[PDB]
């Protein structure tokens, strides 16, 4: 699709068999989802942004369907204010910025 | 133009006549620049993201040219590791997400 930016670019995703809402976020290196369980192994990681650093759980090789497009990659789980799809998965679905 | 997301989408902007590097950020409501010494009136604001909130200075009606595309609006100044162009200005330059 083509998405304008008058509103936050929120879309539905499927992860771990569940539906969630998430923000398509070109300013994110990584994909960060609110606290939940995902299948498999995880390890601690720290990530930063605007307010500083947080601790997250790093899950690798997680399938995520993003407005019907498939990705498989790292998903970080932790106390993010909003679920965000970062560049690690946006690249997989072919997302670009255009102006 | 078209910007891919293999690396951070850093572009040249001009603010106060000066060229700077900033991230085109669809996950940002606002534009956050570290330009601590603009003249003009400002007011205090707090903005949040992954690590919590920070204090910023809110400057209104500031011209910001993004890759040769002129914009004008609110710029928030505060300590950030990367200058970010948020949706308040991205919409002015007709930027969309596409996949």
């Amino acid at each position: 699709p083509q998405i304008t930016l008058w509103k936050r670019p929120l879309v539905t995703i499927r992860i771990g068999g569940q539906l969630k809402e998430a923000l398509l976020d070109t300013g994110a290196d990584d994909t960060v989802i609110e606290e939940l369980n995902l299948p498999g192994k995880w390890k601690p990681k720290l990530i930063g942004g605007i307010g500083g650093f947080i601790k997250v759980r790093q899950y690798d090789q997680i399938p995520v369907e993003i407005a019907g497009h498939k990705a498989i990659g790292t998903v970080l789980v932790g106390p993010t204010p909003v679920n965000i799809i970062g560049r690690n998965l946006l690249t997989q679905i072919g997302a670009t910025l255009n102006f | 133009p078209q910007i891919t997301l293999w690396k951070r989408p850093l572009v040249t902007i001009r603010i106060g006549g000066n060229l700077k590097e900033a991230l085109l950020d669809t996950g940002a409501d606002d534009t956050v620049i570290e330009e601590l010494n603009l003249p003009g009136k400002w007011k205090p604001k707090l903005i949040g993201g992954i690590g919590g909130f920070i204090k910023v200075r809110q400057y209104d009606q500031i011209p910001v040219e993004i890759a040769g595309h002129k914009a004008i609006g609110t710029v928030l100044v505060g300590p950030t590791p990367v200058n970010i162009i948020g949706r308040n200005l991205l919409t002015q330059i007709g930027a969309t997400l596409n996949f």
């Binding site: 976020d25 994110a28 990681k45 930063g48 993010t80 965000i84 | 951070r8 996950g27 903005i47 970010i84």
Partner: peptide, 6 residues
């Protein structure tokens, strides 16, 4: 990792 503003 840096991850972006509300």
């Amino acid at each position: 990792s840096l991850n972006x503003i509300x």
